[PDB]
Amino acid sequence: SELLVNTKSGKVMGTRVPVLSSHISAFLGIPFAEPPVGNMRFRRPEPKKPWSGVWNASTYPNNCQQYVDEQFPGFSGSEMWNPNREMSEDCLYLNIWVPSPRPKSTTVMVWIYGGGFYSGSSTLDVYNGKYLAYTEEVVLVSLSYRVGAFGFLALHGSQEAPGNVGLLDQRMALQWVHDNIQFFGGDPKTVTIFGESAGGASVGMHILSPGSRDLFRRAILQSGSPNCPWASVSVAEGRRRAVELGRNLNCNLNSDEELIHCLREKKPQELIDVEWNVLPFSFVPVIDGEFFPTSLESMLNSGNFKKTQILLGVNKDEGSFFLLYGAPGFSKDSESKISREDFMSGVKLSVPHANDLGLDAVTLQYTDWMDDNNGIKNRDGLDDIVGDHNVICPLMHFVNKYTKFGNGTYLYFFNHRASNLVWPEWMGVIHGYEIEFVFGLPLVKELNYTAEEEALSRRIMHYWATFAKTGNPNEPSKWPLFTTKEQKFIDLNTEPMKVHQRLRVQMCVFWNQFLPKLLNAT
Amino acid sequence: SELLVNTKSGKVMGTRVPVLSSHISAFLGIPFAEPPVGNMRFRRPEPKKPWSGVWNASTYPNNCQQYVDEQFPGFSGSEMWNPNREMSEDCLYLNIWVPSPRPKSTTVMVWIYGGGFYSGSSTLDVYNGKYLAYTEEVVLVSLSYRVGAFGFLALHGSQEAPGNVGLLDQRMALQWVHDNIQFFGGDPKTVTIFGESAGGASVGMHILSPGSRDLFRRAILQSGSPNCPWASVSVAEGRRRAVELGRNLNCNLNSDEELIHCLREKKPQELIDVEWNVLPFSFVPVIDGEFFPTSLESMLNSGNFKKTQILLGVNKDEGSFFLLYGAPGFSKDSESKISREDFMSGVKLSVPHANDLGLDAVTLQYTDWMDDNNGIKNRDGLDDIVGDHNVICPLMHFVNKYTKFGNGTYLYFFNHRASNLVWPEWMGVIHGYEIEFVFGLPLVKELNYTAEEEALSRRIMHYWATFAKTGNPNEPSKWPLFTTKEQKFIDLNTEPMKVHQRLRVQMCVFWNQFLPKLLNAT
Ligand SMILES: COc1ccc2c3c1O[C@H]1C[C@@H](O)C=C[C@@]31CCN(C)C2
Ligand SMILES: COc1ccc2c3c1O[C@H]1C[C@@H](O)C=C[C@@]31CCN(C)C2
Ligand SMILES: *[C@@H]1O[C@H](CO)[C@@H](O)[C@H](O)[C@H]1NC(C)=O
Ligand SMILES: *[C@@H]1O[C@H](CO)[C@@H](O)[C@H](O)[C@H]1NC(C)=O
Ligand SMILES: *[C@@H]1O[C@H](CO)[C@@H](O)[C@H](O)[C@H]1NC(C)=O
Ligand SMILES: *[C@@H]1O[C@H](CO)[C@@H](O)[C@H](O)[C@H]1NC(C)=O
Structure with missing residues (x-):
C-alpha cells in the first residue's frame, strides 16, 4: 500500500x-x-x-x-x-x-x-x-x-x-x-x-x-x-519578562522553581490572557549562548x-498590516489618510527603543518637507518605516x-x-x-x-x-x-x-549603519 | 558749483x-x-x-x-x-x-x-x-x-x-x-x-x-x-586666537597691553603673513555683550x-568657489569630478565643528546610495553642502x-x-x-x-x-x-x-534643526 x-x-x-x-x-x-x-x-x-x-x-x-x-x-x-x-x-x-x-x-x-x-x-x-x-x-x-x-x-x-x-x-x-x-x-x-x-x-x-x-x-x-528587531531578546530581558508574567499571575517569585511550578499549574488561556502585559511580541527566541x-x-x-x-x-x-492593528488613524474601511499628529505618534510607536534624537532622525528621514500634511504621504511613509525597520533592512x-x-x-x-x-x-x-x-x-x-x-x-x-x-x-x-x-x-x-x-539601499543604510550609531552615542 | x-x-x-x-x-x-x-x-x-x-x-x-x-x-x-x-x-x-x-x-x-x-x-x-x-x-x-x-x-x-x-x-x-x-x-x-x-x-x-x-x-x-557659522565667534575664541596671533610673532603674552603693544609694533604684512595660522576666517565679529x-x-x-x-x-x-580654493579634487580648468575618497574628506572639511556622528549624518544626507561613485553627483553634493551649511540655511x-x-x-x-x-x-x-x-x-x-x-x-x-x-x-x-x-x-x-x-526646506531642516540637536547631544 x-x-x-x-x-x-x-x-x-x-x-x-x-x-x-x-x-x-x-x-x-x-x-x-x-x-x-x-x-x-x-x-x-x-x-x-x-x-x-x-x-x-x-x-x-x-x-x-x-x-x-x-x-x-x-x-x-x-x-x-x-x-x-x-x-x-x-x-x-x-x-x-x-x-x-x-x-x-x-x-x-x-x-x-x-x-x-x-x-x-x-x-x-x-x-x-x-x-x-x-x-x-x-x-x-x-x-x-x-x-x-x-x-x-x-x-x-x-x-x-x-x-x-x-x-x-x-x-x-x-x-x-x-x-x-x-x-x-x-x-x-x-x-x-x-x-x-x-x-x-x-x-x-x-x-x-x-x-x-x-x-x-x-x-x-x-x-x-x-536579526530582526522583534525576533529575539537578551537572557536578561527574557528573565525579566518571565518574572513579569509571574507577577501578573500571582506567583511566588522566590525562585525559578517556585515561578515555573506556578506557571505549570495555570490553564492555557490564563497565560494567553496576560501574555501582552509584559512588554517594555512577548515570548521570542533568547540569545542564550547555546542554541546561539x-x-x-x-x-x-x-x-x-x-x-x-x-x-x-x-x-x-x-x-x-501592523499599521492597521496598532497605529492611530488607520482603518480597514477608509483610505487611512494620516495627519501629521498621527504620523508623529506613529513614528514614536514604530521605533519603541529610540530616544528623542532617534525619533527626530526617523521623522526627518521619511517626511517630504514641501508637503508635510499630506495624508497619503504620511500613511505611506509610516508603512515604509515599519516595513523597512522590521522586515526589509534587517533582511x-x-x-x-x-x-x-x-x-x-x-x-x-x-x-x-x-x-x-x-x-x-x-x-x-x-x-x-x-x-x-x-x-x-x-x-x-x-x-x-x-x-x-x-x-x-x-x-x-x-x-x-x-x-x-x-x-x-x-x-x-x-x-x-x-x-x-x-x-x-x-x-x-x-x-x-x-x-x-541595491534593494532599498538609501533607507537601509539609514537603518543598518546610521541609526544604530546614533542610539549608541545617545 | x-x-x-x-x-x-x-x-x-x-x-x-x-x-x-x-x-x-x-x-x-x-x-x-x-x-x-x-x-x-x-x-x-x-x-x-x-x-x-x-x-x-x-x-x-x-x-x-x-x-x-x-x-x-x-x-x-x-x-x-x-x-x-x-x-x-x-x-x-x-x-x-x-x-x-x-x-x-x-x-x-x-x-x-x-x-x-x-x-x-x-x-x-x-x-x-x-x-x-x-x-x-x-x-x-x-x-x-x-x-x-x-x-x-x-x-x-x-x-x-x-x-x-x-x-x-x-x-x-x-x-x-x-x-x-x-x-x-x-x-x-x-x-x-x-x-x-x-x-x-x-x-x-x-x-x-x-x-x-x-x-x-x-x-x-x-x-x-x-548668524552664519563663519560670521562671529565667542569672546573666549576671540581671545584664544588673539593670543595665538601673538605667539606666532613671539610676543610677551603676560598681559593684553604687552600683547597689543607688540601687535602694534609689527608692520601690516607681518600680521597678515600669519593670519591664517590661528584657525582651529580668523578674525570676525565677537558676541561681546556690547555691540550684541x-x-x-x-x-x-x-x-x-x-x-x-x-x-x-x-x-x-x-x-x-570655496571648493575650488580649499578642497581635494577641484580645478578651474577641469570638470572636477570628485572621487568618493575626496567627497568624504571634503565633508570633513566643510563641517569642521562636527564629530564623527555629525559627519556620517551629513554624508548620508547628501549621498545617492545607488550611485555613490558618480563623480559629478559628488562634486554637486559637496557644493550644496558648503552652500547650504554656510550661506542658505543660515539665511x-x-x-x-x-x-x-x-x-x-x-x-x-x-x-x-x-x-x-x-x-x-x-x-x-x-x-x-x-x-x-x-x-x-x-x-x-x-x-x-x-x-x-x-x-x-x-x-x-x-x-x-x-x-x-x-x-x-x-x-x-x-x-x-x-x-x-x-x-x-x-x-x-x-x-x-x-x-x-520653502526655499531648500528639506536640507535646511537638517542643517537648522536636526544637526544642531544631534551635535548638542553628542
Ligand atoms: C511579525 O509577524 C507577525 C506578527 C503578528 C501577526 C502576523 C505576523 O505575520 C503575519 C502573516 C503570517 O506570518 C502569520 C501571522 C501574521 C498575520 C496574523 N496576525 C493576527 C498577527
Ligand atoms: C565667505 O565670504 C568670502 C570669503 C573669502 C573670499 C570671498 C568671500 O566672499 C567672496 C565674494 C565677495 O564677497 C568677496 C570675496 C570672496 C571672493 C574672493 N576671495 C579670494 C575670498
Ligand atoms: C481516521 O479518523 C478519521 C476521523 O473520523 C476517520 O474518518 C477515518 O476513517 C479514520 N481511519 C480509520 C479507518 O481508523
Ligand atoms: C560554491 O562552492 C564551490 C566549492 O565548494 C565553488 O567552487 C562555487 O564557486 C561556489 N558557488 C558560489 C556561487 O559561491
Ligand atoms: C585731485 O587729485 C588728483 C590725483 O592726485 C589730481 O590729478 C587733481 O588735479 C587734484 N585736484 C585738485 C584741484 O587738487
Ligand atoms: C507694518 O507695521 C504697521 C504697524 O506699524 C502695520 O500697519 C502694517 O500692516 C505692517 N506691515 C507688515 C507687512 O507687517
Whole structure:
C-alpha cells in the first residue's frame, strides 16, 4: 500500500486526497515529540516514544495554544491566520504530502509557519501542501512548534524553562525528517527548510545555530530574517519578562522553581490572557549562548554559520498590516489618510527603543518637507518605516553579511497585489500574501485569481522547487545571483522579469549603519 | 558749483564722471574717521577731525590692509576681488555717487562690501556705483571698514583692542551719512544699507545691534546673514586666537597691553603673513555683550532687533568657489569630478565643528546610495553642502526668525549664470556673481553681456531701489511678501518670474534643526 508507511516511531496510515483533478498521498498529524504537557510544559521537547499499531494520519492535528485574533470577527483576511482546528498543548505534529506514485528519492521542502512566535498553525488553508507537492514533484512537509510562553518562556540557568524550546521543537521535527523522510520517497540529503516572517526568522536561526546546521541542505527566507528587531531578546530581558508574567499571575517569585511550578499549574488561556502585559511580541527566541553560541551580529561577522545557498526576499508593503492593528488613524474601511499628529505618534510607536534624537532622525528621514500634511504621504511613509525597520533592512543586512561566505544567494522583491485581495487597496502588497502564490492557490479556479496570477504562481513554485533541488532557481529568462558587488535581485509579479540593484539601499543604510550609531552615542 | 559740497567736517570737491553717455557727480575718498594708525590700531574708530580748505574727492582712496589672493595670477575671475589701489592702514573712507542734477531729498543706498571679514575694498570695478545712482535716481554710498586682525582682533575686557572695531567703522560711516548725506541730495530718513556675503552678515548685525538701529531705515542682505557659522565667534575664541596671533610673532603674552603693544609694533604684512595660522576666517565679529547684547539666537527669538522691511536672498551655487580654493579634487580648468575618497574628506572639511556622528549624518544626507561613485553627483553634493551649511540655511533660519517680528520680508533665489562668466561651468551661479547685476554692469555694452541680462539687471536694480524707497520692491508681475505661513519667494533669472515656497526646506531642516540637536547631544 502507498498509504501505509513504516517509520522508526511506528506505522502510519496516510490518506488519498484530490489535487486539481488527480490525487496524491497525505500523512496528516504525525507525532514527532512527546506532548509537552504537565511538568513538560516549558521544557526542551523529547522525542515521541515509539507506538504500536497503526497511527491514523488522515486528518490535521490540533493547533498549539495561542492568542486568537478577534479584531475583525468573521473577516476572511484576518480569519485565515487563526487556528482552523482545536487548540491544545498536545500539538507537536507534522504533515507530509507525497506525490502519487511514491518517488524514489525526491526533493523535500519543510514549511515553517509564521505568526510572530506567539501564533501560527501548520493547518491553515494557505499552507495546504498538495498543490506544490503535486505540481513540482516534491515531498512537502509542514512542522509545528510551540509559540508564545509555551515555546519561549526563558529562565536562563533553569533546565525546566531554558528558553528556545519552540526552536528545539522545530529542530526535532527536522531531525525526524532526517530520520524518516526516506520512507516517504524523500531524500534526506536534499531538504530545504522555508518559512515566512517569524518562520523566515526561524530558518535563519537554524542556519546560525550549530545544532541545526546538519538537519537541512538549503534555506528559503520569506519576509523575515534571524536579526530582526522583534525576533529575539537578551537572557536578561527574557528573565525579566518571565518574572513579569509571574507577577501578573500571582506567583511566588522566590525562585525559578517556585515561578515555573506556578506557571505549570495555570490553564492555557490564563497565560494567553496576560501574555501582552509584559512588554517594555512577548515570548521570542533568547540569545542564550547555546542554541546561539554568540551574538547574532558577531556570528554573522565571523561567518560562523551554515554555508550553503539561500533564496530570500520581501514584499512591497511589509508594514501596512501592523499599521492597521496598532497605529492611530488607520482603518480597514477608509483610505487611512494620516495627519501629521498621527504620523508623529506613529513614528514614536514604530521605533519603541529610540530616544528623542532617534525619533527626530526617523521623522526627518521619511517626511517630504514641501508637503508635510499630506495624508497619503504620511500613511505611506509610516508603512515604509515599519516595513523597512522590521522586515526589509534587517533582511538586507543579513543578505549582505551572509553572501560574504555563502555558496549562492538569490534575492527577490514581491510586488504583486492579488486581484481578489480582500484587504483595502491602500494596504498594497501585504506581509504574508506572497504565501498563497508560493503554495499554488492561484492554480485552483474556484479561488478566482486571474490567468496571469496562475502563471505567476507557477513560476514562483518552479523557482522554489528548482532552487530546493539544485541550489539555483533557474533551470540551466534568468534570475541572477546576488553578489556583494552587484547586489542584484528581481521583482516577482505578472509582468516580465526586471533585474534591479541595491534593494532599498538609501533607507537601509539609514537603518543598518546610521541609526544604530546614533542610539549608541545617545 | 555742484561738485563742491560743504559738510560738517569740511569742504569736499567731487568730480563729474561719464555714465552710459551722460554724467553724474562722484565724491570719492571722503574721510569719515581718524586714520586708525599707530597707537590707534585695534581701537574703536574716532571721528574724523574737521579740516580746512577743500578735500580733493576726485579719486578712489586706499584699500585696507588685507591678505591678497594670487592663486590665479592675472585671472580676471579672482583678481576682480583683490585690492585695486594701494593698501594702507589709513583706509577709513567712503564714496558717494549723486545723480546730476542734484536731487532735493532722494533715497540713499549704502553698500557694505564682503570678503569674509578678512578682505574687501569699496573701489572694485563691480561696486562702481554710478550706473545704479544714475539709473534709479538714488544717492549711492560705498563705505569701508578694517578687516582681518586690524578690524576684529578681540581681547574682551581691554579697551585698546575690544574687538568689533570693523563693525564700528561701518557704524561711523553710517553715522556720517546720517549727519551729512542731506547736503548731497540724500534723505537721511530713507537709507538702506546693503551688502553681500560678509557685508550681508554685516547689514544683519546692524539690524541686531541697538547702537546701529537708528542709522538706517531698511536693509538688503545678499548671500549672508548675521548668524552664519563663519560670521562671529565667542569672546573666549576671540581671545584664544588673539593670543595665538601673538605667539606666532613671539610676543610677551603676560598681559593684553604687552600683547597689543607688540601687535602694534609689527608692520601690516607681518600680521597678515600669519593670519591664517590661528584657525582651529580668523578674525570676525565677537558676541561681546556690547555691540550684541546677547547671543544672536536669543536676540532673534526675543525680537531684540530693528523692526522694519528686509529684502534678501541667495545664489544657486553658494559653495563652488570655496571648493575650488580649499578642497581635494577641484580645478578651474577641469570638470572636477570628485572621487568618493575626496567627497568624504571634503565633508570633513566643510563641517569642521562636527564629530564623527555629525559627519556620517551629513554624508548620508547628501549621498545617492545607488550611485555613490558618480563623480559629478559628488562634486554637486559637496557644493550644496558648503552652500547650504554656510550661506542658505543660515539665511533661511534668519529669514524665518525675522519675519515673526519684522514689517515685511522679500526673499529671492538668484540662479542666472552670466553668459560671459570667466569661471568654469561646473561652478554654476557663484558666490558674489549677482553683484554685477545689482550694480548694473550688464548695462555697459563693452562688457559683452546679453540683452536679457541687461534687462534682468534693470529689474533687479529697480526692485532694489524701489524697495529702498518704499519697503516694497514692486511699484503699485509681483514679488510676493514672504510670510511664516506661505514662505513664498521668487527666482531671479531671465525667464518670467516664478513664485516658489520653502526655499531648500528639506536640507535646511537638517542643517537648522536636526544637526544642531544631534551635535548638542553628542
Ligand atoms: C511579525 O509577524 C507577525 C506578527 C503578528 C501577526 C502576523 C505576523 O505575520 C503575519 C502573516 C503570517 O506570518 C502569520 C501571522 C501574521 C498575520 C496574523 N496576525 C493576527 C498577527
Ligand atoms: C565667505 O565670504 C568670502 C570669503 C573669502 C573670499 C570671498 C568671500 O566672499 C567672496 C565674494 C565677495 O564677497 C568677496 C570675496 C570672496 C571672493 C574672493 N576671495 C579670494 C575670498
Ligand atoms: C481516521 O479518523 C478519521 C476521523 O473520523 C476517520 O474518518 C477515518 O476513517 C479514520 N481511519 C480509520 C479507518 O481508523
Ligand atoms: C560554491 O562552492 C564551490 C566549492 O565548494 C565553488 O567552487 C562555487 O564557486 C561556489 N558557488 C558560489 C556561487 O559561491
Ligand atoms: C585731485 O587729485 C588728483 C590725483 O592726485 C589730481 O590729478 C587733481 O588735479 C587734484 N585736484 C585738485 C584741484 O587738487
Ligand atoms: C507694518 O507695521 C504697521 C504697524 O506699524 C502695520 O500697519 C502694517 O500692516 C505692517 N506691515 C507688515 C507687512 O507687517
